[PDB]
Amino acid sequence: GSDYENDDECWSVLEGFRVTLTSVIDPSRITPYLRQCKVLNPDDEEQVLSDPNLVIRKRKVGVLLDILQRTGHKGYVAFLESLELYYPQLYKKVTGKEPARVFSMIIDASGESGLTQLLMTEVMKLQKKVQDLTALLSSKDD
C-alpha cells in the first residue's frame, strides 16, 4: 500500500535525506505551521527555537524529525505540509516525484479557514517581500 498505515517507521523516506534537510531547512520558519497540523506541541517549537536565529539549524531539523516522528505518520505528512509550501525541491528530492500536495492533514487539523488564513497572510509577506527585494535591487553594494 501507499503509506496508508500509521506508525513512526513511516519516516524511512525522509530519514536517508536528513543530511540535506538539516543543512537546507530552517525549523524557525516551519514550526508554527507544524502547530496547525496538530503534531508539533508548544514544548517542541520552544526547545527548537531555544536559538531564535539560524545558527544551530543543523541540529534543529535533526532533532525536529525525531520530534515529529513521536506522532508517527501524522508528523511525517505534517513535515511534508510545511515542506511543499516552504521547500518544494526538498519534497521533490525526498520523494523522487512532483509535489503531491496532501494538504488534507492541515485541512482536517486546523480547518480549511485555518489553511486559508495561513496562505492569505503568506501572500501578504510575499507581496511585502517583492518590494523588499526591488528596494535592495535598486540600491546595491556594487
Q: Which residues bind a copy of itself (CB under 8 A)?
A: 85, 88, 101, 103, 107, 112-113, 115-116, 119-120, 122-124, 126-127, 129-130, 133-134, 136-137, 140, 142
> Per the annotation, does 73 bind a ligand?
yes
CB 122 to Zn ion: min, Å: 25
**Cβ(10)–Cβ(79) below 8 Å:** no
Instruction: Please choose which of a copy of itself, Zn ion, none residue 73 contacts, taking the beta carbon within 5 to 8 angstroms, the exact cut-off set by kind.
Output: Zn ion
Return the number of the residue (47 or 113) whose C-beta is nearest a copy of itself. 113
Query: Which of 71, 73, 85, 110 forms a contact with Zn ion (CB under 5 A)?
Result: 73
Return the number of the residue (23 or 127) whose C-beta is nearest a copy of itself. 127
The residues, ordered by sequence, that sit 6+ positions from 78 with a Cβ below 8 Å of its Cβ are 34, 37, 39, 40, 68, 71, 105, 106
- Between CA 59 and CA 103 the distance in angstroms is 27
End-to-end CA distance of the chain: 56
